[PDB]
Amino acid sequence: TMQRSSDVNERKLHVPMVDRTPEDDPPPFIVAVVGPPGTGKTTLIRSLVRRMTKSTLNDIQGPITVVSGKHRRLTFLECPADDLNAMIDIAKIADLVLLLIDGNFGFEMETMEFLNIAQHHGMPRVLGVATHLDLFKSQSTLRASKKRLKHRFWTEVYQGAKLFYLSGVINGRYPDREILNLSRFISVMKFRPLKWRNEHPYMLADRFTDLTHPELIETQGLQIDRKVAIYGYLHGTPLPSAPGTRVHIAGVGDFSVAQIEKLPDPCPTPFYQQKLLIYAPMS
Amino acid sequence: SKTYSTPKRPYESSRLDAELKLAGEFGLKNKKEIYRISFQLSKIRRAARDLLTRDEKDPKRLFEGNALIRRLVRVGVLSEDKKKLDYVLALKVEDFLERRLQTQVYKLGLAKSVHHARVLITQRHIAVGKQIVNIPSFMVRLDSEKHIDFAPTSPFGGARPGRVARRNAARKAE
Amino acid sequence: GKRAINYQILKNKGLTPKRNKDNRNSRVKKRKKYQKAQKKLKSVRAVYSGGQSGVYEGEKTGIKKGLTRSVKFK
Amino acid sequence: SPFGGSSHAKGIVLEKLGIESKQPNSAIRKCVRVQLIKNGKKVTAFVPNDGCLNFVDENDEVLLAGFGRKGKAKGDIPGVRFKVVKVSGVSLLALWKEKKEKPR
Amino acid sequence: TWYELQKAKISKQLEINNIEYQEMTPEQRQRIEGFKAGSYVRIVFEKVPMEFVKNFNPKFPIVMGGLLPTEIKFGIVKARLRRHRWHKKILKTNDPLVLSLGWRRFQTLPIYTTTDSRTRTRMLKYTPEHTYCNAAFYGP
Amino acid sequence: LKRLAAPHHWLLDKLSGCYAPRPSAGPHKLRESLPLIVFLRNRLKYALNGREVKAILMQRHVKVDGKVRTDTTYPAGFMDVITLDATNENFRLVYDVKGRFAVHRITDEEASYKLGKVKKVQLGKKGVPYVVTHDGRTIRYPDPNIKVNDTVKIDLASGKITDFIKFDAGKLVYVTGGRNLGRIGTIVHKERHDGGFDLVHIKDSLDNTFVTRLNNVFVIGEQGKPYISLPKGKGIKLSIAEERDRR
Amino acid sequence: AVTIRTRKVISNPLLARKQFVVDVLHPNRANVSKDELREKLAEVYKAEKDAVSVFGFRTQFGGGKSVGFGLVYNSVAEAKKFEPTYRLVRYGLAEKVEKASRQQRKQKKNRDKKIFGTGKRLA
RNA sequence: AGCAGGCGCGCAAAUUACCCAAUCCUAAUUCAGGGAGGUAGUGACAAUAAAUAACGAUACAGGGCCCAUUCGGGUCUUGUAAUUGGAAUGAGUACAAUGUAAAUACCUUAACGAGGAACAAUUGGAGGGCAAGUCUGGUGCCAGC
Ligand SMILES: Nc1nc2c(ncn2[C@@H]2O[C@H](COP(=O)(O)OP(=O)(O)OP(=O)(O)O)[C@@H](O)[C@H]2O)c(=O)[nH]1
Ligand SMILES: [Mg+2]
């Protein structure tokens, strides 16, 4: 089997790429719950935060940064399922995508458009979550829908991807066994380098304040192009600290930075580096 | 197991016309059916060649040849008069696959074509005495050749008429 | 007001030649190949087709004088 | 055997060889310069169907295989021993018949 | 082999980069390389328009990417294009469409062209039905 | 719990799980005994599954050669009796023409005793002569004309000896073990090497002069008058081809 | 109309049962409805409808007949004492369901092996 | 130091399921237990069985069919038409029963379930032909890609 021994170690050899993800303060890997309207997202977010920090979250909004495991943390984002103007830049920023399908309906064209946008703009780690298995007692049809969805999904994304199935919701949160065997996977995540997120300094905003003078807006009369503080969390290549950098935030057009400032970290490092925990802003 | 075997060459003109004639004559599905019947024919007459090449009056040749001809007359591919061992050597694939249930119910009648025979006995209508057989490749034994009739729980026998007939009776009696 | 996916995106095929309803079921294609080749060799031999069916209406298709389809012994 | 023992080798495309060939679907148009990774060398691969040449652009981590002509053609060049069978994870036959989608 | 040679090259580059980064803090953290990765930072922008803060919604994400020195200039750009194979209708030239070219997303008017056997670039009145073609448009 | 290659004269079903029963320590060896699980589960089929066999063993219905022996894996091997008090049954398990454990339905007056070959005659303690037998019933005070490789007739109410068959040239014999199993008749030749490989040769209705190891043979009684009954025509193995030629 | 027919009947006073093979023949119906079968078998024998048991059914191919195994006891108390619990809960006479199934039972077993203490627990 | 799930590079395949019901085994010992073991899920590695259609009726058409290095040979008993008709079904779907430790599957089975039977079979391979179109060569109107 020397031919197989020389033929299966060609899986290793790829294009050499560079990473720039330093091993001292790795960012929360932004994952992005996206899919159809209605099904999934908010209850899956509530289940993941209830199993990762043992505390519920009612009326969630905006990006959370929860902690999972010892070293590193991660970031959730309920992307709205009605606009490509959020779907596109979520697929441009995201690193994992736990992607919702509903098995009593087949696929849906919002997750179709999301998977095509991801396939073009640079493949994140995709992971399918097939929810809504209120199908019937006919476990033959349950196995049939899961089999056809798995084969269609493995054609659409890489063949062999994980497709976690969820049953019905037990009073707001998902079945905790399935949330356990999903959370163990996204703790053993193992991401990959991509050229766009290793060539551009990119940041997801999670707090948004307007430090413009109230007397000034009250004497100008709702006309000014104000000044705005984005309290956020950068990923990727180092955003250069000198003010004057052109930074485009999405959906309004570009600006230049005025001043930036490093803050106390609102998420855990290891406690030995502390000496020598869900953080849910915009809420 | 590995019943069927690929022949000594599968891309050849005479073999291609062989499979074309046999398939279109006995109403067959693919080359695997001819290859299965041809294989087991080759196996039993390869076993018959050794019993021929050893001498007569050996107990091996005597009652193993009697065993082989009893099994072959039980399947029915050997006539009642040629009960000696070299007619097994002179066997052929045509009167060996002629005893399958498709061809046999077409010969018995009741089907009006070989292909209609195949599609009805896979639509579960023909029962050898008591047992409904829904498979063509049966090789029906000689004793149960006269027990072929439409099964009683099927509307070509004497059951309730089918769903097409009673649905048309409903929406033509409305 | 809920979307769905259509047939070609569900099946994920496309840009193929027009294939054949005869080519679908192999038992049918190995029937419509035989009964053509059954009618092909009414043009290389003259096969037996029952015989004198009606009354003898003549040979009905032409007899020619200068033609001998008899294999001769060298 | 043509490259050590393996039947397929992942490779990095340098540049589409012969974009300026005027005759469409020609031999000098359907070549790419692949950097073989298993020993780090250059080779000239032969992607079929110039209409599906333009999937591969530049370091698309392409996967080669042998060619093996079953006769003699009209204006085919010799020397190309390698054809493209898979590009960046997917198979470009499936890409050219537009089932899958090229990921980037 | 060659791939482990290239990986050893870039990883030794990153290692010597870190080993001469691990130095005095005002230069080597925030004025020679500037907030590497994973730093909760506040940014301010003046001249941000009103409707952003007037009707900001907490549901929608606010991503922000920096620009390289080349991707603030304007002018034409020549891309390759293809009708996405499940779109039921083909793309006529001078019909505007939204693009996710990089960070910016923008409606622009393209012109689909093709090199007629690679001698000149003439304007098509329609995109081809299943294969690629060149295209040119004003944009970032 | 090592199994699935049992002694294949037990004839257990192979699609019956994976394992096969381990006979415990007892009066007979491993591969020449037959435990009551294999007996009452797939040899005469009075109980379906092994825990039901444990139920009929625990409920005192079965006794092997006199006393109850409430145990599943009890290796009740050759020549003993099994007096099922209900069903009035006396299973003596003996051998057959082919190598299996044939059963009987013994009368009570014959099931009241059993026999067996001795293995040694010794002087145990305080100058007491005691003999053994093949099923471990080391019994004291024999008649001292008991020789090695001879049979005594145990009374099975007490452990006393009622009679013995002093084997010599010419008294009716059984066999056990080896490829000449289940044969009778003792009168052709009596060979005695030095180190085994010897037999009292056999004479039957067809007078087949046969031999085996002397460890693989033991006695029954007088010619034509045996002490034990024997199953299915007092097993001979003439020929199945001659049987299908005659009848 | 169906029929039942028993064969291979052997008495067995080692359990005071009679065990046999049951052939039910139904010309058009699906299958023979084990509760109704059980009361019919206890009617044709002299049994209880509680001391008769049938388990190993299989409908043979093409429909029409079904073959299975069949038990009739006597002394309904002895039927309780001899037939296993899964059969005795398939009939409605004795129930057994416990919540600590495998995982929440064995984790409780291992932690209770770790406990070593009774209800004296003051902190 | 085994089961399940992982890691083993950035590009890859089973579940962190059920259970002592079977076979055995251990213990004071029928009764407790056993990731020994069994059951189920996933599973184009392999193997066997075979459904995607079957039978009729009608209409015109013949400058038409088919075969053999060529001229020859033989044939409406040859093709195109929803012109069109009713019959039979299981893939499914599903009361129920069956199986089983319980449950799935199969085996049964009432009521549904077919015309483009769209209830949509693929993978290859050999040829063409078409423009107010494109390109290269030249001994016009051509040859090639
Ligand atoms: N029966 C059943 N209901 C579900 C299941 N999953 C979600 N639902 C229902 O779907 C409803 C919507 O919940 P979410 O999915 O959290 O709503 P959302 O994520 O905010 O989606 P949007 O409102 O469109 O943004 C819930 O109230 C659930 O009752 C499921 O698996 N089974
Ligand atoms: Mg929501």
mmCIF file of C-alpha atoms (C1' of nucleotides) in Angstrom, chain H:
data_model
loop_
_atom_site.group_PDB
_atom_site.id
_atom_site.type_symbol
_atom_site.label_atom_id
_atom_site.label_comp_id
_atom_site.label_asym_id
_atom_site.label_seq_id
_atom_site.Cartn_x
_atom_site.Cartn_y
_atom_site.Cartn_z
ATOM 1 C "C1'" A H 1 -6.288 1.383 29.784
ATOM 2 C "C1'" G H 2 -11.579 -0.117 26.600
ATOM 3 C "C1'" C H 3 -16.798 2.515 24.441
ATOM 4 C "C1'" A H 4 -18.868 6.994 22.533
ATOM 5 C "C1'" G H 5 -16.970 11.697 20.842
ATOM 6 C "C1'" G H 6 -12.625 14.504 19.535
ATOM 7 C "C1'" C H 7 -7.219 16.160 18.570
ATOM 8 C "C1'" G H 8 -3.609 14.449 15.285
ATOM 9 C "C1'" C H 9 -2.007 20.591 9.102
ATOM 10 C "C1'" G H 10 -5.792 25.666 7.225
ATOM 11 C "C1'" C H 11 -9.383 21.388 3.094
ATOM 12 C "C1'" A H 12 -13.069 16.912 6.325
ATOM 13 C "C1'" A H 13 -17.103 10.847 7.000
ATOM 14 C "C1'" A H 14 -20.534 6.668 12.419
ATOM 15 C "C1'" U H 15 -23.924 8.374 18.148
ATOM 16 C "C1'" U H 16 -20.898 11.877 23.331
ATOM 17 C "C1'" A H 17 -28.180 6.962 21.220
ATOM 18 C "C1'" C H 18 -31.009 2.470 23.808
ATOM 19 C "C1'" C H 19 -30.764 -1.991 27.030
ATOM 20 C "C1'" C H 20 -29.887 -6.419 30.299
ATOM 21 C "C1'" A H 21 -34.676 -8.890 26.442
ATOM 22 C "C1'" A H 22 -31.098 -12.966 24.024
ATOM 23 C "C1'" U H 23 -25.808 -15.559 24.769
ATOM 24 C "C1'" C H 24 -22.825 -15.998 28.668
ATOM 25 C "C1'" C H 25 -20.058 -14.398 33.167
ATOM 26 C "C1'" U H 26 -19.349 -12.653 38.478
ATOM 27 C "C1'" A H 27 -21.232 -12.005 43.390
ATOM 28 C "C1'" A H 28 -23.672 -13.975 49.896
ATOM 29 C "C1'" U H 29 -25.965 -15.542 44.647
ATOM 30 C "C1'" U H 30 -33.251 -17.313 40.362
ATOM 31 C "C1'" C H 31 -33.987 -11.429 41.777
ATOM 32 C "C1'" A H 32 -28.216 -7.111 41.531
ATOM 33 C "C1'" G H 33 -24.771 -6.052 37.532
ATOM 34 C "C1'" G H 34 -21.556 -6.231 32.929
ATOM 35 C "C1'" G H 35 -19.577 0.463 26.802
ATOM 36 C "C1'" A H 36 -18.475 -8.347 27.913
ATOM 37 C "C1'" G H 37 -22.606 -8.506 24.812
ATOM 38 C "C1'" G H 38 -27.242 -7.277 22.161
ATOM 39 C "C1'" U H 39 -30.609 -3.326 19.646
ATOM 40 C "C1'" A H 40 -31.144 1.103 16.852
ATOM 41 C "C1'" G H 41 -29.158 5.397 14.083
ATOM 42 C "C1'" U H 42 -25.226 6.867 10.333
ATOM 43 C "C1'" G H 43 -23.104 3.742 6.103
ATOM 44 C "C1'" A H 44 -22.667 3.405 -2.890
ATOM 45 C "C1'" C H 45 -16.388 -0.488 1.255
ATOM 46 C "C1'" A H 46 -18.515 -4.748 -0.026
ATOM 47 C "C1'" A H 47 -22.516 -8.922 -1.291
ATOM 48 C "C1'" U H 48 -27.986 -10.775 -2.835
ATOM 49 C "C1'" A H 49 -33.261 -9.553 -4.779
ATOM 50 C "C1'" A H 50 -35.344 -5.661 -8.600
ATOM 51 C "C1'" A H 51 -39.401 -0.642 -9.496
ATOM 52 C "C1'" U H 52 -38.958 3.751 -12.860
ATOM 53 C "C1'" A H 53 -43.962 1.056 -16.605
ATOM 54 C "C1'" A H 54 -47.772 -3.084 -19.130
ATOM 55 C "C1'" C H 55 -51.805 -4.162 -22.832
ATOM 56 C "C1'" G H 56 -54.944 -2.433 -26.584
ATOM 57 C "C1'" A H 57 -57.670 0.903 -30.224
ATOM 58 C "C1'" U H 58 -57.442 4.679 -34.137
ATOM 59 C "C1'" A H 59 -55.422 8.151 -37.729
ATOM 60 C "C1'" C H 60 -52.863 9.859 -41.859
ATOM 61 C "C1'" A H 61 -47.576 9.183 -44.194
ATOM 62 C "C1'" G H 62 -45.125 6.459 -48.016
ATOM 63 C "C1'" G H 63 -40.105 11.711 -52.678
ATOM 64 C "C1'" G H 64 -40.339 5.495 -47.179
ATOM 65 C "C1'" C H 65 -37.232 2.016 -44.201
ATOM 66 C "C1'" C H 66 -32.987 -1.200 -43.423
ATOM 67 C "C1'" C H 67 -28.394 -3.937 -44.640
ATOM 68 C "C1'" A H 68 -23.460 -4.837 -47.304
ATOM 69 C "C1'" U H 69 -15.459 -2.233 -49.306
ATOM 70 C "C1'" U H 70 -20.173 0.781 -54.703
ATOM 71 C "C1'" C H 71 -22.803 0.178 -58.589
ATOM 72 C "C1'" G H 72 -26.222 -4.563 -55.267
ATOM 73 C "C1'" G H 73 -29.983 -6.959 -51.813
ATOM 74 C "C1'" G H 74 -34.598 -7.069 -49.040
ATOM 75 C "C1'" U H 75 -39.026 -5.395 -47.083
ATOM 76 C "C1'" C H 76 -45.493 -1.378 -44.888
ATOM 77 C "C1'" U H 77 -45.450 -7.550 -42.023
ATOM 78 C "C1'" U H 78 -42.122 0.863 -41.395
ATOM 79 C "C1'" G H 79 -42.210 5.226 -39.138
ATOM 80 C "C1'" U H 80 -44.711 9.478 -37.116
ATOM 81 C "C1'" A H 81 -49.055 10.991 -34.512
ATOM 82 C "C1'" A H 82 -51.416 13.230 -26.297
ATOM 83 C "C1'" U H 83 -56.331 11.835 -32.255
ATOM 84 C "C1'" U H 84 -57.008 7.328 -27.669
ATOM 85 C "C1'" G H 85 -59.009 3.885 -24.149
ATOM 86 C "C1'" G H 86 -59.457 1.752 -19.778
ATOM 87 C "C1'" A H 87 -57.062 -2.165 -16.387
ATOM 88 C "C1'" A H 88 -52.840 -3.422 -12.741
ATOM 89 C "C1'" U H 89 -49.557 -1.503 -9.219
ATOM 90 C "C1'" G H 90 -45.759 -0.165 -5.221
ATOM 91 C "C1'" A H 91 -42.184 4.300 -4.095
ATOM 92 C "C1'" G H 92 -44.852 6.804 -0.804
ATOM 93 C "C1'" U H 93 -48.712 8.212 2.897
ATOM 94 C "C1'" A H 94 -51.321 6.108 6.829
ATOM 95 C "C1'" C H 95 -55.520 4.336 10.438
ATOM 96 C "C1'" A H 96 -54.345 -0.343 13.119
ATOM 97 C "C1'" A H 97 -52.026 -4.898 14.394
ATOM 98 C "C1'" U H 98 -47.255 -7.219 14.068
ATOM 99 C "C1'" G H 99 -42.115 -7.413 15.647
ATOM 100 C "C1'" U H 100 -39.144 -5.508 20.289
ATOM 101 C "C1'" A H 101 -36.373 -4.716 26.824
ATOM 102 C "C1'" A H 102 -39.342 -0.265 24.492
ATOM 103 C "C1'" A H 103 -39.111 1.568 19.670
ATOM 104 C "C1'" U H 104 -37.423 1.661 14.116
ATOM 105 C "C1'" A H 105 -37.121 -1.518 9.743
ATOM 106 C "C1'" C H 106 -39.218 -5.819 7.088
ATOM 107 C "C1'" C H 107 -43.405 -9.083 7.018
ATOM 108 C "C1'" U H 108 -49.039 -7.797 7.042
ATOM 109 C "C1'" U H 109 -53.020 -3.881 5.932
ATOM 110 C "C1'" A H 110 -58.110 -0.995 6.009
ATOM 111 C "C1'" A H 111 -58.524 4.704 3.531
ATOM 112 C "C1'" C H 112 -55.630 7.676 0.337
ATOM 113 C "C1'" G H 113 -51.584 7.172 -3.439
ATOM 114 C "C1'" A H 114 -50.425 8.002 -12.102
ATOM 115 C "C1'" G H 115 -50.222 10.156 -16.910
ATOM 116 C "C1'" G H 116 -45.661 14.591 -19.410
ATOM 117 C "C1'" A H 117 -47.568 8.055 -15.362
ATOM 118 C "C1'" A H 118 -43.820 16.233 -13.587
ATOM 119 C "C1'" C H 119 -44.667 10.264 -8.249
ATOM 120 C "C1'" A H 120 -39.186 13.974 -13.304
ATOM 121 C "C1'" A H 121 -32.129 7.741 -14.178
ATOM 122 C "C1'" U H 122 -27.965 8.911 -14.376
ATOM 123 C "C1'" U H 123 -22.887 8.446 -16.211
ATOM 124 C "C1'" G H 124 -20.115 8.504 -20.443
ATOM 125 C "C1'" G H 125 -19.067 8.324 -25.942
ATOM 126 C "C1'" A H 126 -19.460 9.249 -31.518
ATOM 127 C "C1'" G H 127 -21.050 12.641 -35.050
ATOM 128 C "C1'" G H 128 -23.243 16.700 -37.285
ATOM 129 C "C1'" G H 129 -25.762 21.259 -39.110
ATOM 130 C "C1'" C H 130 -26.880 26.858 -38.605
ATOM 131 C "C1'" A H 131 -25.147 33.842 -38.908
ATOM 132 C "C1'" A H 132 -25.720 40.390 -42.264
ATOM 133 C "C1'" G H 133 -20.783 37.046 -36.253
ATOM 134 C "C1'" U H 134 -15.632 36.648 -34.839
ATOM 135 C "C1'" C H 135 -10.045 35.107 -36.036
ATOM 136 C "C1'" U H 136 -5.533 33.060 -38.893
ATOM 137 C "C1'" G H 137 -3.291 31.834 -43.523
ATOM 138 C "C1'" G H 138 -3.630 32.543 -49.800
ATOM 139 C "C1'" U H 139 -2.228 31.203 -56.185
ATOM 140 C "C1'" G H 140 -10.320 35.861 -56.307
ATOM 141 C "C1'" C H 141 -15.689 32.931 -54.916
ATOM 142 C "C1'" C H 142 -10.928 29.141 -50.756
ATOM 143 C "C1'" A H 143 -8.559 26.171 -46.739
ATOM 144 C "C1'" G H 144 -8.268 25.899 -41.125
ATOM 145 C "C1'" C H 145 -9.155 26.847 -36.106
#
